[PDB]
Structure 1
Amino acid sequence: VHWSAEEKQLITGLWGKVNVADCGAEALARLLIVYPWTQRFFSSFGNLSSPTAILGNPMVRAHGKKVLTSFGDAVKNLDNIKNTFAQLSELHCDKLHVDPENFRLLGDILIIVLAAHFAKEFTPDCQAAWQKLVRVVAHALARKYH
Structure 2
Amino acid sequence: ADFDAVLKCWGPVEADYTTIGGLVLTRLFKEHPETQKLFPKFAGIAQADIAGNAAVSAHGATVLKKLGELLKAKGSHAAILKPLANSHATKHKIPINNFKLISEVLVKVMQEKAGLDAGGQTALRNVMGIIIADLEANYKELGFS
TM range (shorter): 0.7 to 0.9
Counterpart selection for 1:82 from 62, 73, 78: 78
Query: Which residue of structure 1 lines up, in the alignment, with residue 42 of structure 2?
Result: 45
| Letter in structure 2 aligned against 1:103 | F
Indicate yes or no: 2:118 matched with 1:124.
yes
Is the CA contact 1:11–1:126 (under 8 Å) kept in the aligned structure 2? Answer: yes
- Which of 96, 100, 124 does residue 92 from structure 2 map onto? 96
Which structure has greater helix proportion? Answer: 1
Q: TM-score, structure 1 length as denominator?
A: 0.84
Q: Does 1:68 align with 2:72?
A: no
| Equivalent in the alignment of 1:36 | 33
Distance (Å, rounded) in 2 between the aligned partners of 1:115 and 1:56: 22
Question: Residue 143 of structure 2 corresponds to which residue in structure 1?
Answer: none
Show the counterpart of 1:115: 111
In the superposition, the TM-score normalised over structure 2's length comes to: 0.85
> Which residue number corresponds to residue 128 of structure 2?
134
Identity fraction in percent: 25
Q: Could you say if the C-alpha distance between residues 20 and 93 of structure 1 is closer, same or farther in structure 2, counting changes exceeding 3 Å?
A: same
* 1:88 maps to amino acid: L
1:17 match: 12
Number of residue pairs the alignment of both structures matches: 138
Instruction: Provide the rounded CA distance (Å) in 1 between the counterparts of 2:130 and 2:74.
Output: 10
Query: Compared with structure 1, are the counterparts of its residues 30 and 76 closer, same or farther at alpha carbon in structure 2 (3 Å cutoff)?
Result: same
Displacement after TM superposition at 1:78 (Å): 1.1
Give, in whole Å, the separation in 2 of the partners of 1:30 and 1:127.
18
- Unpaired runs of 5+ residues, structure 2, are 141-145
Q: What CA distance in whole angstroms lies between the structure 1 residues aligned with 2:138 and 2:90?
A: 8
Tell me, which stretches of 5 or more residues in structure 1 are unaligned? none
| Relative contact order higher in (CA < 8 Å, ≥ 6 apart) | 2
